[PDB]
């Protein structure tokens, strides 16, 4: 199994009410032996990052179904590097709102992975 105790911060992006999917991901994470600090929905980058930094997690899972995801993750990647959290891995799963050209872009920016519906 896992070597260390893996901590996560999960949340839905800003103004994104749809947390139906992110509440499923935090259950699978939990069942696989992860300590999940769930933040719920409507979370700004400044919030999520502050949570991740204080909790000192290994990973961040953000769902975005309202669009504006590119600028959002870029902000988070930037803000994480600035305040000593570049080794924290950011993950994306906004269903299919993110097209391949945007997945490739964000992953190149600093985002760990963005999972395509494929």
């Amino acid at each position: 199994g896992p070597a260390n105790k893996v901590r996560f911060v999960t949340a839905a992006s800003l103004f994104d009410g749809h947390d139906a999917s992110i509440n499923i991901m935090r259950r699978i994470l939990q069942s696989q032996g992860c300590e999940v600090i769930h933040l719920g929905h409507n979370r700004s980058v400044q919030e999520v990052v502050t949570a991740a930094l204080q909790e000192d997690v290994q990973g961040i899972a953000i769902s975005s179904y309202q669009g504006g995801h590119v600028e959002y993750f870029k902000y988070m990647i930037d803000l994480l590097r600035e305040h000593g959290g570049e080794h924290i891995q950011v993950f994306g799963g906004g269903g299919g709102v993110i097209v391949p050209d945007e997945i490739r872009e964000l992953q190149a920016y600093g985002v760990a992975r963005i999972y395509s519906p494929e």
Partner: protein, 865 residues
């Protein structure tokens, strides 16, 4: 028991009391499940008052089988203590009875419990009641909380052997963290401070009102617990009305049968006046109103018989539209029942349009005039939307504007450089941040003009936006006075103008808080707080005779889009509507003052129940408003807007959508709706084109003008299917009323997430059948196309404009900014009228500033799971 909830509120008290001077570290512990190995550290999600540099929180899993704390707690604490914090708050997981591991690692201990602890003897088993420096009986709004306080306070007195003290003096507090600015929590806080203070802690003299006492006064409850079962009471009210209909009908039937048989004896010779004796008994048995109904029936028939509706000033109205064939189509077709039992039954259950219970409509006849062209505009900044408004409303006398705000404004925030906000500004709605932006939005338009009404859909920040709109309408007349006279109005002249504006201003805020949490999940303020301010607005309207503006539009559209079936949508929406009624009543307001200003909003789908939705909504309202609340005719008339279902509009084969939108528009018009919106066929893919919006508008024009059956205004009435479906749907709604009532009313059900739960259920049941092929959708899961399976909206300059106009506004009111914001908070603490302050606040504060101020005082929506 509300561990995290109470903790968050306590931190907020620290921040408010010491003006954010204290550096507080929060160490949370939750149990880790031994099977999974994982843990749900779900304490941070409840924390609203930790978003500040002086606050630090680290969530921990117990990482131990039979422990309520982490085995590494003392080191973690020591680290925080060394980090030069002012106070370290540690919380454990769910305690048993014998568990009390927090006691040695902390200086002060606070046991938190609920009024449900079992028999009083159970308190003699709880080890923590023997060590706790403070005990907080949270959720003090539950049943048996008062007795729970007595029992616990006595037990702590007994444990401490302080029989020389009063039980009411024990450190046992009755708190209710769920409610904003709870005095109970403050009372607990006052105690904690004195204890911490004596135990070596520097604290400034408190700014919080030093409240004495031990229990929460249960202040700021919206719907009083005495009125908890209001929805059930309404269900009984309607059912009682129907049982009367059955009884009175039988009486009317027998009365007619007797006098009929009596006349047949006199024609045959031999007579028996014992028949008349029985008939005379029926005359008194029949009610006063029931008797007058049958009395006016022959006269009623003669009225609708002619070609004109003759009703010492007269008003004639056309009753007949002659067809192309020469056939006369009556607008309202009356039944041809010979049985007086049926006549009475029909007059009580489904009277003609414009008569109680207004089942077939609230008005006598449909308006012959052209439909009120709703001119909705909203995109970019205030300048662009104002242009859009003026371009559509060119040359028309009916200035009927409908405003849409961008997501930034919809959440009460100011536009900002921040990437998570900047992108949202201007996109999908107008960006309104300051009162200046609001004035630009409605420039040129005379808001006080009798032929100008302004609709605007805003929910969370509605009271603030309304305050801006009011100040705009007022300043428009202050400007018009300084222009007509050349001199500024005096103190007496201005106040005379200002008061006149408030009365005559027309418009509507499409605000519905109860829809926000139930279907949408879009709340920015706590439901209880919004309702308080909602009442504050309605109270303000009363005081200044604001009789031409509407502050509440009760929607169920978003609920339906979320997956709710027609019965759930109708029932929840009416329930919400009744909640608003109950809320305004508890504030001590008269029913005939706010009931006529209640708009409704439903979604029309393909389901059978949709055909009889409007009529059911009208009868349930009309009956209860007359019987339960005893309101006038103008209040018994439920007026609603129907918008065709977007849930039924698909991206697969979009040309089919007009077929569905037609059928939905038809039953809406058939059932005498008050307002109809028709969706474009490509709303499921792209932005409604100017061509696509014509096809949508043509559906209404074709039905209203070309369609023959629509020439008749009550075509639904009489149908065996309609009357049965009306009865079925009505009953189903009543039963739903009962289920919500036995959950503490609408608000109580929202605590359990009962609405959101049921909606999500019915949504999946739809999806299951849709995917299964069970529920057929043409073009989607059947009759699929063989040939194949298948912007910006805001200028960069516009975004920079809003940013510039904001910082310009902020600098222009830098002096009066903080002073006004503090005044606003104090009005919430002192439980004053919030909207009253907003009327002054919006002139020196921005939307974001006001919203975040109300966040600080505690009105912010707390997430849950």
């Amino acid at each position: 028991a509300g561990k995290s909830s109470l903790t968050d509120e306590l931190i907020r008290r620290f921040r408010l009391d010491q003006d954010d001077a204290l550096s507080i570290a929060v160490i949370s512990i939750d149990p880790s499940r031994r099977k999974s190995g994982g843990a749900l550290l779900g304490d941070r999600i409840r924390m609203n008052a930790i978003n500040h540099p002086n606050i630090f929180m680290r969530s921990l899993a117990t990482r131990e089988a039979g422990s309520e704390i982490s085995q590494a707690l003392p080191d973690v604490i020591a680290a925080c203590k060394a980090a030069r914090f002012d106070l370290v708050i540690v919380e454990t997981s769910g305690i048993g009875q014998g568990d009390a591991a927090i006691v040695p690692h902390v200086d002060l201990s606070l046991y938190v419990m609920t009024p449900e602890f079992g028999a009083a003897s159970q308190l003699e088993k709880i080890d923590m009641l023997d060590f706790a420096d403070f005990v907080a009986i949270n959720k003090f709004d539950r049943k048996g909380a008062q007795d729970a306080w007595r029992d616990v306070a006595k037990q702590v007195q007994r444990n401490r052997e302080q029989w020389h003290s009063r039980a009411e003096d024990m450190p046992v507090y009755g708190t209710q963290a769920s409610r904003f600015n709870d005095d109970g929590v403050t009372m607990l806080y006052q105690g904690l401070v004195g204890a911490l203070g004596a135990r070596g802690m520097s604290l400034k003299p408190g700014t919080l009102p030093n409240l004495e006492g031990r229990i929460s006064t249960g202040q700021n409850v919206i719907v009083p617990p005495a009125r908890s079962r209001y929805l059930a009471e309404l269900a009984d009210t309607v059912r009682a009305y129907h049982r009367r209909v059955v009884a009175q009908s039988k009486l009317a039937r027998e009365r007619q049968q007797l006098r009929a048989a009596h006349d047949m004896l006199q024609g045959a010779g031999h007579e028996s006046a014992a028949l008349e004796t029985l008939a005379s008994e029926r005359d008194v048995s029949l009610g006063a109103v029931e008797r007058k109904l049958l009395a006016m029936w022959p006269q009623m028939q003669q009225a609708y018989s002619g070609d004109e509706y003759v009703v010492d000033k007269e008003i004639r109205t056309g009753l007949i539209s002659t067809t192309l064939s020469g056939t006369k189509i009556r607008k309202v077709v009356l039944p041809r029942f010979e049985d007086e039992g049926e006549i009475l039954k029909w007059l009580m259950r489904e009277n003609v349009p414009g008569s109680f219970p207004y089942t077939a409509g609230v008005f006598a006849f449909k308006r012959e005039g052209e439909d009120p062209t709703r001119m909705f505009a909203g995109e970019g900044d205030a300048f662009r939307t104002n242009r859009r408004f003026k371009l559509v409303s060119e040359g028309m006398e009916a200035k009927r504007l409908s405003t849409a705000f961008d997501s930034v404004t919809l959440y009460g925030e100011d536009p900002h450089e921040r990437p998570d906000i900047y992108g949202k500004v201007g996109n999908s709605g107008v960006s309104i941040a300051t009162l200046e932006d609001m004035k630009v939005l409605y420039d040129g338009f005379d808001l006080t003009n009798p032929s100008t009404s302004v609709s605007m859909t805003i929910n969370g920040p509605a009271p603030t936006i309304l305050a801006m709109f009011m100040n705009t309408a007022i300043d428009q007349q202050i400007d018009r006075f300084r222009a007509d006279n050349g001199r500024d109005p005096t103190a007496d002249e201005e106040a005379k103008i200002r008061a006149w504006v408030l009365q005559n201003v027309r418009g509507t805020v499409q605000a519905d808080i109860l829809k926000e949490d139930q279907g949408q999940n879009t709340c920015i303020f706590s439901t209880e707080f919004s309702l308080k301010v909602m009442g504050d607005i309605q109270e303000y309207f009363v005081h200044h005779q604001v009789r031409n503006f509407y502050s509440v539009s009760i929607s169920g559209y978003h609920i339906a889009e979320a997956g709710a079936n027609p019965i759930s949508q109708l029932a929840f929406t009416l329930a919400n509507g009744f909640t608003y009624v109950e809320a305004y009543l508890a504030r001590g307001m008269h029913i005939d003052d706010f009931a006529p200003n209640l708009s409704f909003f439903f979604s029309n789908g393909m389901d059978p129940e949709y055909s009889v939705l409007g009529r059911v909504a009208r009868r349930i309202w009309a009956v209860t408003m007359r019987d339960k609340y005893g309101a006038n005719d103008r209040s018994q008339k439920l007026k609603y807007h129907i918008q065709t279902s977007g849930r039924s509009l698909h991206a697969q084969e979009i040309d089919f959508n007009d077929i569905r939108t037609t059928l939905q528009a038809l039953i809406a018009i058939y059932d005498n709706c008050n307002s109809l919106h028709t969706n474009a066929y490509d709303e499921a893919i792209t932005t409604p084109t100017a061509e696509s919006v014509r096809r949508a508008l043509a559906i209404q024009l074709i039905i209203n003008r070309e369609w023959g059956v629509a020439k008749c205004e009550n075509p639904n009435q009489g149908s065996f299917l309609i009357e049965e479906l009306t009865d079925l749907v009505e009953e189903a709604v009543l039963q739903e009323f009962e289920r919500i009532a036995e959950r503490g009313g609408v608000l109580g059900a929202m605590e359990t997430g009962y609405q959101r739960g049921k909606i999500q259920e019915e949504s999946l049941y739809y999806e299951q059948l849709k995917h299964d092929g069970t529920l057929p959708i043409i073009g989607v899961n059947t009759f699929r196309n063989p040939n194949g399976d298948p912007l910006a909206r805001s200028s960069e300059d516009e975004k920079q404009s809003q940013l510039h106009r904001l910082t310009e506004f902020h600098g222009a009111h830098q002096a009066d900014a903080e002073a006004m914001l503090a005044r606003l908070r104090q009005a919430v603490i002192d439980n004053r009228n919030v909207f009253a302050v907003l009327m002054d606040a919006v002139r020196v504060c921005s939307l974001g500033q006001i919203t975040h101020a109300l966040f600080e005082v505690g009105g912010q929506y707390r997430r849950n799971m």
